[PDB]
Design a protein around this motif. Sequence first.
Motif, PDB file in Angstrom:
ATOM      1  N   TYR A   1       0.825  -1.209   0.000  1.00 37.72           N
ATOM      2  CA  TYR A   1       0.000   0.000   0.000  1.00 37.72           C
ATOM      3  C   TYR A   1       0.860   1.261   0.000  1.00 37.72           C
ATOM      4  O   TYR A   1       0.650   2.194   0.779  1.00 37.72           O
ATOM      5  N   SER A   2       1.844   1.284  -0.895  1.00 37.66           N
ATOM      6  CA  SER A   2       2.788   2.384  -0.995  1.00 37.66           C
ATOM      7  C   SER A   2       2.932   2.809  -2.451  1.00 37.66           C
ATOM      8  O   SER A   2       2.447   2.144  -3.372  1.00 37.66           O
ATOM      9  N   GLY A   3       3.613   3.931  -2.649  1.00 42.96           N
ATOM     10  CA  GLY A   3       3.754   4.508  -3.969  1.00 42.96           C
ATOM     11  C   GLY A   3       2.557   5.363  -4.338  1.00 42.96           C
ATOM     12  O   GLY A   3       1.753   5.769  -3.495  1.00 42.96           O
ATOM     13  N   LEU A   4       2.444   5.636  -5.636  1.00 41.32           N
ATOM     14  CA  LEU A   4       1.327   6.427  -6.134  1.00 41.32           C
ATOM     15  C   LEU A   4       0.015   5.675  -5.942  1.00 41.32           C
ATOM     16  O   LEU A   4      -0.052   4.452  -6.102  1.00 41.32           O
ATOM     17  N   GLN A   5      -1.034   6.416  -5.598  1.00 42.67           N
ATOM     18  CA  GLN A   5      -2.349   5.856  -5.334  1.00 42.67           C
ATOM     19  C   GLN A   5      -3.350   6.342  -6.373  1.00 42.67           C
ATOM     20  O   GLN A   5      -3.284   7.485  -6.836  1.00 42.67           O
ATOM     21  N   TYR A   6      -4.293   5.469  -6.723  1.00 41.60           N
ATOM     22  CA  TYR A   6      -5.324   5.795  -7.700  1.00 41.60           C
ATOM     23  C   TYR A   6      -6.664   5.251  -7.235  1.00 41.60           C
ATOM     24  O   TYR A   6      -6.789   4.060  -6.935  1.00 41.60           O
ATOM     25  N   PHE A   7      -7.659   6.132  -7.174  1.00 43.02           N
ATOM     26  CA  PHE A   7      -9.003   5.777  -6.747  1.00 43.02           C
ATOM     27  C   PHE A   7      -9.816   5.312  -7.948  1.00 43.02           C
ATOM     28  O   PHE A   7      -9.841   5.981  -8.987  1.00 43.02           O
ATOM     29  N   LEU A   8     -10.475   4.163  -7.805  1.00 38.52           N
ATOM     30  CA  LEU A   8     -11.298   3.589  -8.862  1.00 38.52           C
ATOM     31  C   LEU A   8     -12.681   3.300  -8.304  1.00 38.52           C
ATOM     32  O   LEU A   8     -12.813   2.589  -7.301  1.00 38.52           O
ATOM     33  N   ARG A   9     -13.704   3.852  -8.946  1.00 34.98           N
ATOM     34  CA  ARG A   9     -15.086   3.523  -8.645  1.00 34.98           C
ATOM     35  C   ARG A   9     -15.571   2.468  -9.634  1.00 34.98           C
ATOM     36  O   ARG A   9     -14.831   2.013 -10.510  1.00 34.98           O
ATOM     37  N   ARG A  10     -16.835   2.073  -9.488  1.00 34.21           N
ATOM     38  CA  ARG A  10     -17.413   1.060 -10.362  1.00 34.21           C
ATOM     39  C   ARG A  10     -17.370   1.516 -11.816  1.00 34.21           C
ATOM     40  O   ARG A  10     -17.706   2.659 -12.138  1.00 34.21           O
ATOM     41  N   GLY A  11     -16.950   0.615 -12.690  1.00 35.59           N
ATOM     42  CA  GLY A  11     -16.826   0.916 -14.100  1.00 35.59           C
ATOM     43  C   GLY A  11     -15.715   0.093 -14.719  1.00 35.59           C
ATOM     44  O   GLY A  11     -15.134  -0.781 -14.083  1.00 35.59           O
ATOM     45  N   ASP A  12     -15.431   0.397 -15.984  1.00 38.78           N
ATOM     46  CA  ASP A  12     -14.404  -0.292 -16.752  1.00 38.78           C
ATOM     47  C   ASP A  12     -13.351   0.710 -17.201  1.00 38.78           C
ATOM     48  O   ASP A  12     -13.685   1.799 -17.679  1.00 38.78           O
ATOM     49  N   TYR A  13     -12.085   0.334 -17.051  1.00 40.41           N
ATOM     50  CA  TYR A  13     -10.950   1.194 -17.367  1.00 40.41           C
ATOM     51  C   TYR A  13     -10.077   0.451 -18.372  1.00 40.41           C
ATOM     52  O   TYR A  13      -9.342  -0.469 -18.000  1.00 40.41           O
ATOM     53  N   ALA A  14     -10.170   0.840 -19.645  1.00 42.71           N
ATOM     54  CA  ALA A  14      -9.465   0.134 -20.713  1.00 42.71           C
ATOM     55  C   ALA A  14      -7.968   0.406 -20.728  1.00 42.71           C
ATOM     56  O   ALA A  14      -7.212  -0.400 -21.281  1.00 42.71           O
ATOM     57  N   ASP A  15      -7.527   1.520 -20.159  1.00 44.72           N
ATOM     58  CA  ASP A  15      -6.113   1.841 -20.069  1.00 44.72           C
ATOM     59  C   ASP A  15      -5.832   2.310 -18.655  1.00 44.72           C
ATOM     60  O   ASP A  15      -6.734   2.760 -17.942  1.00 44.72           O
ATOM     61  N   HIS A  16      -4.561   2.229 -18.255  1.00 45.40           N
ATOM     62  CA  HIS A  16      -4.221   2.716 -16.928  1.00 45.40           C
ATOM     63  C   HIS A  16      -4.368   4.229 -16.834  1.00 45.40           C
ATOM     64  O   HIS A  16      -4.556   4.753 -15.730  1.00 45.40           O
ATOM     65  N   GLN A  17      -4.315   4.936 -17.967  1.00 44.19           N
ATOM     66  CA  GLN A  17      -4.562   6.375 -17.965  1.00 44.19           C
ATOM     67  C   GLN A  17      -6.005   6.690 -17.592  1.00 44.19           C
ATOM     68  O   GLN A  17      -6.280   7.760 -17.034  1.00 44.19           O
ATOM     69  N   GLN A  18      -6.937   5.771 -17.876  1.00 41.05           N
ATOM     70  CA  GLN A  18      -8.337   5.995 -17.530  1.00 41.05           C
ATOM     71  C   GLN A  18      -8.554   6.124 -16.027  1.00 41.05           C
ATOM     72  O   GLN A  18      -9.561   6.705 -15.609  1.00 41.05           O
ATOM     73  N   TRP A  19      -7.642   5.600 -15.207  1.00 44.13           N
ATOM     74  CA  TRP A  19      -7.665   5.852 -13.772  1.00 44.13           C
ATOM     75  C   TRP A  19      -6.559   6.813 -13.346  1.00 44.13           C
ATOM     76  O   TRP A  19      -6.145   6.807 -12.182  1.00 44.13           O
ATOM     77  N   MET A  20      -6.096   7.655 -14.274  1.00 39.49           N
ATOM     78  CA  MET A  20      -5.051   8.656 -14.054  1.00 39.49           C
ATOM     79  C   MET A  20      -3.704   8.033 -13.707  1.00 39.49           C
ATOM     80  O   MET A  20      -2.807   8.724 -13.213  1.00 39.49           O
ATOM     81  N   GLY A  21      -3.534   6.739 -13.967  1.00 42.00           N
ATOM     82  CA  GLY A  21      -2.263   6.096 -13.687  1.00 42.00           C
ATOM     83  C   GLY A  21      -1.181   6.564 -14.645  1.00 42.00           C
ATOM     84  O   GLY A  21      -1.425   6.796 -15.829  1.00 42.00           O
ATOM     85  N   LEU A  22       0.033   6.703 -14.119  1.00 39.60           N
ATOM     86  CA  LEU A  22       1.178   7.137 -14.906  1.00 39.60           C
ATOM     87  C   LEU A  22       2.070   5.982 -15.336  1.00 39.60           C
ATOM     88  O   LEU A  22       3.101   6.214 -15.972  1.00 39.60           O
ATOM     89  N   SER A  23       1.699   4.750 -15.001  1.00 39.10           N
ATOM     90  CA  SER A  23       2.448   3.564 -15.391  1.00 39.10           C
ATOM     91  C   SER A  23       1.513   2.367 -15.286  1.00 39.10           C
ATOM     92  O   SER A  23       0.357   2.495 -14.873  1.00 39.10           O
ATOM     93  N   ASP A  24       2.021   1.196 -15.670  1.00 40.40           N
ATOM     94  CA  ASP A  24       1.261  -0.042 -15.569  1.00 40.40           C
ATOM     95  C   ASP A  24       1.610  -0.835 -14.314  1.00 40.40           C
ATOM     96  O   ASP A  24       1.380  -2.047 -14.268  1.00 40.40           O
TER      97      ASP A  24
END
Length: 171
Positions: A50-73
């Motif tokens: 539970y360390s490093g960058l954090q990303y909040f995800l609600r119910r739905g589908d995220y086709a890319d990691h950018q869709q959850w504002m992620g900067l990496s995979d």
Amino acid sequence: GKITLYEDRGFQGRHYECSSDHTNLQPYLSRCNSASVDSGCWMLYEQPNYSGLQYFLRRGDYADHQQWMGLSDSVRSCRLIPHSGSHRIRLYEREDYRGQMIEFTEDCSCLQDRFRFNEIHSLNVLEGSWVLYELSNYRGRQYLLMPGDYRRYQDWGATNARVGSLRRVID
């Protein structure tokens, strides 16, 4: 809560399904490029434990990691965020709950419109789980908060005290 994480974009490749907190997804996932949240609200973490960058995800589908504002995979741990019927949080100007202070029971997309400080150095989460945001309108680095004390900004996993907005976690 139920989340399915995929190694490749567009919900392909080896996948792994979670319904509880995982502190080490590495044995089941070498990367994460898409995610499907069937139920619940989730926080993904770039590093294990539970360390490093954090990303909040609600119910739905995220086709890319950018869709959850992620900067990496890199997704190596995740948390199913506890639901709560009431929310109350206190943000403080200085560490150890000192200085000016402001309380929130709602979301706030622009903290600086109500507090006159670009930085929060301590906070107390009295009820509910929150996502804290470095920048206004829920942008920048995200920090999951849960009921408990946070006497210094390092306690919510931050390397700086910048806070711009905060959102309650509701299902």
